[PDB]
Amino acid sequence: YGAIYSVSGPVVIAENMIGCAMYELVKVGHDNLVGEVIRIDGDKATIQVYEETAGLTVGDPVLRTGKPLSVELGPGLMETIYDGIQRPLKAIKEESQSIYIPRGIDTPALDRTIKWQFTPGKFQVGDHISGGDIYGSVFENSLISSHKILLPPRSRGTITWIAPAGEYTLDEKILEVEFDGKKSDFTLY
Amino acid sequence: AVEQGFNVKPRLNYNTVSGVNGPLVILEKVKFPRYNEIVNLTLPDGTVRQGQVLEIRGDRAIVQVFEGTSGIDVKKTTVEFTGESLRIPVSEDMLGRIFDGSGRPIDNGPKVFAEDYLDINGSPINPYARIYPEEMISTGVSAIDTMNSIARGQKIPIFSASGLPHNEIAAQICRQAGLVNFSIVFAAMGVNLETARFFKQDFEENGSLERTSLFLNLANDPTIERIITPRLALTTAEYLAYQTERHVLTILTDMSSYADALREVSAAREEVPGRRGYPGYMYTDLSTIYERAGRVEGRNGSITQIPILTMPNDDITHPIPDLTGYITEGQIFVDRQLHNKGIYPPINVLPSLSRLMKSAIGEGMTRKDHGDVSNQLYAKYAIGKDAAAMKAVVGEEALSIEDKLSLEFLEKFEKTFITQGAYEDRTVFESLDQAWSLLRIYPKEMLNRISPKILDEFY
Amino acid sequence: KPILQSLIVEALLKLLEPKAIVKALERDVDLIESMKDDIMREYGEKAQRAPLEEIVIS
Amino acid sequence: EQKNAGGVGELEKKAEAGVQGELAEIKKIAEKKKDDVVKILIETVIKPSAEVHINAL
Numbered sequence: 001y002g003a004i005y006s007v008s009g010p011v012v013i014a015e016n017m018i019g020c021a022m023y024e025l026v027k028v029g030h031d032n033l034v035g036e037v038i039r040i041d042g043d044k045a046t047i048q049v050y051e052e053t054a055g056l057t058v059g060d061p062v063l064r065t066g067k068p069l070s071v072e073l074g075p076g077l078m079e080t081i082y083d084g085i086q087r088p089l090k091a092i093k094e095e096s097q098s099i100y101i102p103r104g105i106d107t108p109a110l111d112r113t114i115k116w117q118f119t120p121g122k123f124q125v126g127d128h129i130s131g132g133d134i135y136g137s138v139f140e141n142s143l144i145s146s147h148k149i150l151l152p153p154r155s156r157g158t159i160t161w162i163a164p165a166g167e168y169t170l171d172e173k174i175l176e177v178e179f180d181g182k183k184s185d186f187t188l189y
Numbered sequence: 190a191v192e193q194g195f196n197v198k199p200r201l202n203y204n205t206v207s208g209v210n211g212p213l214v215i216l217e218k219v220k221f222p223r224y225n226e227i228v229n230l231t232l233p234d235g236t237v238r239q240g241q242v243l244e245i246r247g248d249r250a251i252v253q254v255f256e257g258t259s260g261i262d263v264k265k266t267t268v269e270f271t272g273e274s275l276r277i278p279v280s281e282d283m284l285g286r287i288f289d290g291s292g293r294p295i296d297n298g299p300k301v302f303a304e305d306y307l308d309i310n311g312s313p314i315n316p317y318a319r320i321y322p323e324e325m326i327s328t329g330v331s332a333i334d335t336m337n338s339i340a341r342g343q344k345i346p347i348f349s350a351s352g353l354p355h356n357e358i359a360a361q362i363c364r365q366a367g368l369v370n371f372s373i374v375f376a377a378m379g380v381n382l383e384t385a386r387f388f389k390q391d392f393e394e395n396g397s398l399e400r401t402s403l404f405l406n407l408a409n410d411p412t413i414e415r416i417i418t419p420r421l422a423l424t425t426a427e428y429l430a431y432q433t434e435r436h437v438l439t440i441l442t443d444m445s446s447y448a449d450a451l452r453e454v455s456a457a458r459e460e461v462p463g464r465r466g467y468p469g470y471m472y473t474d475l476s477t478i479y480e481r482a483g484r485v486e487g488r489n490g491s492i493t494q495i496p497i498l499t500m501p502n503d504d505i506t507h508p509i510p511d512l513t514g515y516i517t518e519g520q521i522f523v524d525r526q527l528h529n530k531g532i533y534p535p536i537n538v539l540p541s542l543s544r545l546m547k548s549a550i551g552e553g554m555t556r557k558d559h560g561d562v563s564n565q566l567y568a569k570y571a572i573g574k575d576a577a578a579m580k581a582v583v584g585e586e587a588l589s590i591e592d593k594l595s596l597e598f599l600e601k602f603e604k605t606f607i608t609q610g611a612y613e614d615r616t617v618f619e620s621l622d623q624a625w626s627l628l629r630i631y632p633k634e635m636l637n638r639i640s641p642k643i644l645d646e647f648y
Numbered sequence: 649k650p651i652l653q654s655l656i657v658e659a660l661l662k663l664l665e666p667k668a669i670v671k672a673l674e675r676d677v678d679l680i681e682s683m684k685d686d687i688m689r690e691y692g693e694k695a696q697r698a699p700l701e702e703i704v705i706s
Numbered sequence: 707e708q709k710n711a712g713g714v715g716e717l718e719k720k721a722e723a724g725v726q727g728e729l730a731e732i733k734k735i736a737e738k739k740k741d742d743v744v745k746i747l748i749e750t751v752i753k754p755s756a757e758v759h760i761n762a763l
Contacts (some may be wrong), residue, residue, distance in 0.1 A: 030460070054224060058222050100312035100315060101315050220757050658754070664759070695762075
């Protein structure tokens with residue numbers, strides 16, 4: 001939880017940013033602007049803000065999200081229109097009800113208000129599932145008949161529980177992986 | 190109802206000034222500096238000048254002074270932090286008034302009785318909320334309308350050089366810009382008083398001061414207000430076109446002068462230059478300016494931006510024309526060779542381009558043959574230029590029959606089709622008929638780029 | 649008198665400095681001299697810090 | 707053209723007469739709602755507005 005030290009165009013230098021990591025998204029300012037740390041020097045982490053940096057003042061809190069620039073992969077992105085970052089332009093227009101893009105808009109990349117039909121894959125409870133394996137399928141469109149749900153890569157273990165067939169949203173749990181005794185909850189995305 | 194306007198926020202008058210360097214003023218101790226903040230530098234002489242905070246350190250604030258730093262003391266100068274970005278007062282009555290480079294009245298009239306305070310930088314329009322223009326503007330110039338069409342909502346600049354009649358061409362386009370009335374927002378960035386007087390006189394004679402707003406930043410005006418004038422004019426245009434639902438045609442002139450101002454500010458900041466000293470972020474700044482043109486889904490109203498530009502040495506490869514071609518869609522190339530030959534307008538249709546012509550031209554919008562005729566004209570003009578080069582380098586008899594016919598076409602094209610007197614106002618249909626008359630020089634066989642059905646139906 | 653109470657405090661909370669120099673009209677000097685203690689206590693309460701060390705009526 | 711300028715001079719009186727009609731309401735519109743605006747302006751200039759910077763907290 002550092003503080004803004006310097007602002008000059010997109011490049012923002014934030015002090016007290018100790019323990020940060022390179023190319024880690026950090027919410028700069030009070031509007032929670034997305035920015036990736038591109039340079040570190042001591043406790044100051046140079047950040048490039050992904051939105052309009054005008055109005056940022058020294059002392060504004062900078063929140064470390066702890067993850068790199070991550071794209072939300074899953075059902076629901078097969079038709080939508082995205083900005084540079086995975087910002088849904090249609091969802092932004094619908095929620096904001098305006099022709100502008102509000103600063104620090106936090107609309108989820110994949111909308112969670114749509115119920116997706118899910119058919120579990122060949123994997124069952126107790127089987128060993130590795131990264132990238134298929135444990136389901138989602139009927140997205142007529143063209144994309146089966147949006148096969150992939151277990152995230154570099155995530156592995158044994159299926160503690162798998163959901164039955166039914167209309168599930170992205171926030172809802174789909175499958176559970178135990179690994180080394182630390183059960184992990186995996187959703188549609 | 191904007192009831193939040195009734196609020197007083199006292200401002201911090203900093204007498205802590207240092208590092209006054211060129212266009213830049215540096216404040217040693219600032220309590221929570223705000224980036225892109227407007228300050229009011231009160232000189233020891235008593236005159237105030239607005240300034241923009243370019244960068245903030247922990248306690249510093251590198252301020253750029255729009256009116257210049259000539260006379261700024263380090264001891265008696267007080268800098269007052271307003272606390273917000275620059276907000277021009279906009280109104281519907283703001284049409285018909287002449288403004289300074291910093292949005293101050295020049296016509297000896299009152300200050301704008303503000304209807305709202307709009308930020309200069311505006312807001313980023315949702316690309317999903319934009320409309321593809323697809324509405325041709327009958328600019329009345331043959332070399333433009335027929336071969337590089339302008340759609341209502343298209344940012345098409347006029348690339349020109351020093352001494353060419355770019356001002357005359359743009360004034361003509363503004364005077365005669367009906368669709369196949371327009372409000373106008375004119376921004377003068379460093380143009381000489383002769384050019385500003387020409388533009389104002391032409392607007393008044395045509396009857397445009399009823400529905401125009403001039404932001405005149407002359408050459409004698411301070412050289413950093415050229416950074417702010419296009420933004421003020423463009424947010425005025427955004428207001429007039431989106432909230433009052435008008436159709437605005439912005440004529441930002443001497444964007445080369447704007448880029449020179451940018452380079453001057455960039456050079457003073459001692460930052461990584463880029464190409465020819467122009468700031469590396471010149472693409473981003475030019476995109477921020479140019480990309481404020483077009484139509485929006487909810488609101489019927491557009492900014493038909495036509496940013497006049499001046500090539501330093503008639504070179505496209507220069508950073509300003511190159512980036513302007515990258516961002517702004519299309520280009521109207523004013524040719525020194527054509528002007529020397531005496532053609533008006535001296536528009537060279539080979540470099541001139543319009544990305545939205547293929548969609549705003551033809552198929553019942555104007556006429557069935559517009560696109561094919563413009564392709565045929567471009568192809569035969571390129572053939573004529575190549576044949577002229579070949580006939581200069583080698584013997585004339587070595588040129589083929591097609592090459593000789595194309596030389597004749599090029600002569601009859603520059604001298605009759607492109608050549609258009611001021612106030613002529615050729616309709617797009619009349620220009621197409623004249624272009625066909627030029628294309629009837631060739632036998633039907635060699636009009637290869639014309640679709641055979643149209644060739645049979647129009648030859 | 650209550651209006652001047654906020655005007656001095658409103659600017660004090662913007663400065664946020666341990667010391668102050670309140671330049672006022674010659675007729676409000678007595679009022680500010682009387683109410684310096686209240687101003688200090690209000691600034692200490694509103695700025696979430698210790699009351700400012702000294703206020704000087706210029 | 708001189709007659710047009712002379713007519714414009716007559717039109718200047720006509721324009722002034724037209725302007726006098728519009729700005730007659732401007733004086734009337736002001737006085738009708740002047741005392742209400744002053745009440746808002748006075749109450750705002752004096753209103754206690756004491757709040758530190760958000761960053762200072």
